[PDB]
Design an enzyme around this catalytic site. Structure first.
Site, PDB file in Angstrom:
ATOM      1  N   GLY A 150       1.088  -1.276  -0.314  1.00 44.81           N
ATOM      2  CA  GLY A 150      -0.037  -0.037  -0.186  1.00 44.81           C
ATOM      3  C   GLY A 150       0.891   1.280   0.041  1.00 44.81           C
ATOM      4  O   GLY A 150       1.766   1.172  -0.801  1.00 44.81           O
ATOM      5  N   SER A 151       0.588   2.448   1.031  1.00 41.94           N
ATOM      6  CA  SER A 151       1.083   3.732   1.015  1.00 41.94           C
ATOM      7  C   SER A 151       2.564   3.677   1.392  1.00 41.94           C
ATOM      8  O   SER A 151       3.232   4.444   1.229  1.00 41.94           O
ATOM      9  CB  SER A 151      -0.271   4.591   1.753  1.00 41.94           C
ATOM     10  OG  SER A 151      -1.340   4.350   0.678  1.00 41.94           O
ATOM     11  N   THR A 152       2.694   2.479   1.761  1.00 44.85           N
ATOM     12  CA  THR A 152       4.542   2.485   3.437  1.00 44.85           C
ATOM     13  C   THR A 152       5.619   2.576   1.494  1.00 44.85           C
ATOM     14  O   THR A 152       6.450   2.876   1.523  1.00 44.85           O
ATOM     15  CB  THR A 152       4.183   1.194   3.581  1.00 44.85           C
ATOM     16  OG1 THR A 152       4.247   0.331   2.870  1.00 44.85           O
ATOM     17  CG2 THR A 152       3.678   1.411   4.445  1.00 44.85           C
TER      18      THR A 152
ATOM     19  N   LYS B  64       4.839   4.286  -1.218  1.00 46.34           N
ATOM     20  CA  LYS B  64       4.878   5.283  -1.924  1.00 46.34           C
ATOM     21  C   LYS B  64       6.169   6.412  -1.783  1.00 46.34           C
ATOM     22  O   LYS B  64       6.735   7.214  -2.544  1.00 46.34           O
ATOM     23  CB  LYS B  64       3.706   6.307  -1.741  1.00 46.34           C
ATOM     24  CG  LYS B  64       2.159   5.681  -2.223  1.00 46.34           C
ATOM     25  CD  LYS B  64       0.676   6.487  -1.415  1.00 46.34           C
ATOM     26  CE  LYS B  64      -0.119   5.796  -2.180  1.00 46.34           C
ATOM     27  NZ  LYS B  64      -1.289   5.801  -1.170  1.00 46.34           N
TER      28      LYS B  64
ATOM     29  N   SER C 200      -1.308  11.149   1.762  1.00 49.66           N
ATOM     30  CA  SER C 200      -1.034   9.283   1.240  1.00 49.66           C
ATOM     31  C   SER C 200      -2.572   9.833  -0.090  1.00 49.66           C
ATOM     32  O   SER C 200      -3.128   8.789   0.126  1.00 49.66           O
ATOM     33  CB  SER C 200      -1.674   8.558   1.602  1.00 49.66           C
ATOM     34  OG  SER C 200      -0.901   7.629   2.065  1.00 49.66           O
TER      35      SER C 200
END
Length: 479
Positions: free
Chosen positions: A219-221, A223, A275
């Site tokens: 997921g966003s980790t 980004k 995010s």
């Protein structure tokens, strides 16, 4: 008699014993010899803690044999107490029983041995040749192994991960602490966990080393790594603005949707703070997925760690000759790949180590290997400052702030594709001179498909605060 080998001692990085072969005593008997002293049996049966009839049954039943075991695994002191009775036909041989002083705290990392004292899981298996010697006939003992684990940090991470799961009612969790400069794995705890000493029961879900075998979409980790590829392209700078209104973006049949849809213009740091999947997707469309794939592949995502642990799942970083917009976007915001908590920590350690990646290590690192400069020091410094803003700025992840330090990190919501909800936080500290990297995974905070959200950030805060103290890192946020 070709003598057996003495199993080598496993310690933490400071010498604290983690797996020691302690001497035990085994009593055996010659039945034909014991049959000549039946009047000693009730006394001998009591010293062994056995029923008079059942003990007498075993001897008479195996009277024609000349070797049976009476009891194995006694302590040296207890074994001498029975031998002191001098009952005819009772003999003694001192053995070795593998003991784990830390018990459930380092169960998944250390592993265990089987009945024939052979490494079956964990470090005991990965270094079985190193810890087991070779069998008159001369027998050489096994070599000592010092792990990268800091038992002080391990106890801290274990009880804080356990306390967080009980507070939220979560099913499972993982926590990895990493030294960003040396590649050492300072702590690796998994819940649920088992006791390697007390292996009468054997719950299979407890023996799961989830930090290395559970794969999830980060997921966003990841980004920050997409942003790294943007900054390295020469087409983006931190002051650039991206318009993410109205929180959605249509790409043909698919529609990218942001979790928070209350923004219009955001700079590059605000794309990480909010995010925004839309914002990171528009950046990816401009720079191309190849530059993002290259960064994620170079920091180890979906790549073999080289630790040699049993059951290590590599994950999957998909590659394409031609990246459509959908696969470009899903990769950019972390749903187009699958990783382990160990890989995610390793990748964050590279970013924190001013962009230099160092190979993972489960053993103590004396000579630090030459790293690979994956991300430039200038881009790494810029992204570091952005992740510090994710934790400290307005609307940021404030639960992750460490008292007296500048922390940096990114929160995410993992998905194991039926799908599974995991809460993620990956970070490092101190932001202005990183020393420690940490990844916290929580399997279904309240329930499967719940609304807990940011549950890993407080664990990052408490554990990082303790790990910095235990390592005497100077505070850099003294108001």
């Amino acid at each position: 008699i070709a003598i057996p080998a003495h199993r080598g001692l496993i310690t933490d990085r400071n010498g604290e014993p983690l797996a020691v072969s302690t001497p035990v005593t085994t009593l055996w008997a010659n039945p034909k010899e014991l049959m000549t002293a039946k009047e000693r049996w009730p006394q001998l049966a009591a010293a062994l803690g056995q029923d008079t009839k059942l003990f007498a049954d075993r001897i008479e039943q195996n009277a024609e044999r000349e070797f049976i075991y009476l009891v194995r695994g006694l302590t040296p002191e207890q074994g001498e107490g029975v031998i002191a009775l001098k009952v005819p036909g009772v003999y003694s041989i001192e053995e070795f029983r593998r003991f784990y002083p830390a018990g459930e705290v380092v169960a998944h990392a250390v592993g265990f041995t089987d009945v024939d004292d052979r490494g079956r899981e964990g470090i005991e298996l990965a270094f079985d040749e190193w810890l087991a010697g070779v069998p008159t006939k001369n027998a050489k003992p096994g070599k000592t192994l010092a792990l990268s684990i800091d038992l002080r940090l391990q106890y801290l991470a274990h009880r804080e991960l356990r306390n967080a799961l009980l507070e939220n009612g979560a099913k499972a969790g993982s926590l990895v602490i990493m030294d960003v400069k040396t590649g050492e794995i300072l702590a690796m705890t998994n819940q649920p966990t088992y006791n390697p000493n007390n292996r009468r029961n054997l719950q299979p879900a407890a023996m799961r080393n989830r930090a290395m075998i559970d794969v999830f979409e980060p997921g966003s980790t990841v980004k920050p790594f997409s942003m790294s590829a943007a900054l390295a392209s020469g087409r983006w700078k931190p002051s650039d603005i991206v318009d993410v209104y109205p929180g959605t973006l249509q790409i043909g049949r698919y529609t990218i949707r942001d979790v928070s849809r209350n923004s219009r213009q955001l700079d590059l740091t605000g794309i990480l703070i909010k995010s925004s999947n839309v914002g990171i997707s528009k950046i990816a469309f401009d720079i191309g997925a190849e530059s993002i794939y290259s960064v994620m592949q170079q920091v180890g995502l979906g790549q073999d760690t080289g630790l040699g642990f049993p059951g290590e799942r590599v994950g999957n970083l998909p590659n394409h000759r031609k990246w459509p917009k959908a696969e470009t976007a899903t990769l950019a915001y972390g749903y187009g790949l699958s990783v382990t908590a160990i890989q995610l920590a390793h990748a964050y350690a590279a970013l924190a180590n001013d962009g230099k990646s160092v190979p993972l290590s489960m053993t103590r690192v004396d000579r630090v290997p030459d790293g690979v400069q994956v991300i430039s020091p200038e881009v790494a410094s810029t992204v570091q400052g952005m992740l510090q803003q994710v934790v400290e700025a307005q609307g940021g992840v404030f639960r992750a702030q460490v008292p007296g330090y500048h922390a940096a990190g990114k929160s995410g919501t993992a998905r194991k594709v039926e799908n599974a909800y995991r809460s993620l936080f990956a970070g490092f500290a101190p932001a202005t001179d990183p020393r420690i990297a940490m990844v916290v995974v929580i399997d279904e905070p309240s329930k499967a498909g719940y609304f807990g959200g940011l549950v890993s950030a407080p664990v990052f805060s408490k554990v990082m605060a303790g790990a910095l103290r235990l390592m005497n890192v100077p505070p850099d946020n003294l108001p």
